[PDB]
Amino acid sequence: FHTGIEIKVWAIACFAPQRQCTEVHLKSFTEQLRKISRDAGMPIQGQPCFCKYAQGADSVEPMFRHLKNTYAGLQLVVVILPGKTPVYAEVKRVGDTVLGMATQCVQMKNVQRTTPQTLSNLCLKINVKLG
């Protein structure tokens, strides 16, 4: 576990349908993630600079280029996926091999209803990636 990580600039891109993963699910998940990451010594220091819905793998590269071109110092994009989807491969293609943007994916079902264990799982993955 890495100490001294602070996440100051981050975004959320939700590829799950809004009707299944609503704004209140996203805001609850956001605040619960911020709380446990601060508890663990990896504080997420503010609200995401960007939190929007996207549909389809075709939206990945334009949205990520937009993020890179709009938010200086972006550290992480949290990507909500609706189950198994071709969106995953495209997010990793653009993030890992095109633009060099750290991404962390999370399943829609763990945003609709968080648990401490699944928030912990996400925190540890982020800590490894940014550490």
Ligand X SMILES: O=c1ccn([C@@H]2O[C@H](COP(=O)(O)OP(=O)(O)OP(=O)(O)O)[C@@H](O)[C@H]2O)c(=O)[nH]1
Which listed range, 18-26, 41-49, 52-60, 99-107, lies at the site for ligand X (CB under 6 A)? 99-107
**Cβ nearer to a second copy, comparing 54 with 94:** 54
Which residues in the 103-122 window bind ligand X by CB under 6 A? 103-107
Query: 95, 64 in Cβ contact below 8 A?
Result: yes
Report, in this order, helix, strand and coil percent for the chain, each rounded to 5.
50, 15, 35
Spell out the alpha helix ranges (H) of 1-131: 23-39, 60-70, 87-92, 109-112, 116-130
Q: Are 103 and 93 in contact (CB under 8 A)?
A: no
38 binds ligand X (CB under 6 A): no
Query: Is the CB of 34 or the CB of 95 nearer to ligand X?
Result: 95
Residue 88 interacts with, from ligand X, a second copy, none (CB under 5-8 Å by kind): ligand X
Q: Which two tokens stand for residue 49?
A: 């600079």
Task: Give the Cβ contact number of residue 106 at 10 Å.
Answer: 22
Q: Residue 104: which of a second copy, ligand X, none does it interact with, CB under 5 to 8 A by kind? A: ligand X
CA–CA gap between residue 47 and residue 87 (Å, rounded)? 24
Q: Which residues bind ligand X (CB under 6 A)?
A: 81, 83-85, 88, 92, 103-107, 125, 129
Q: Which residues bind a second copy (CB under 8 A)?
A: 1-3, 18-20, 22-25, 27-28, 30-32, 35-36, 39-42, 112-117, 119-121, 123-124, 127
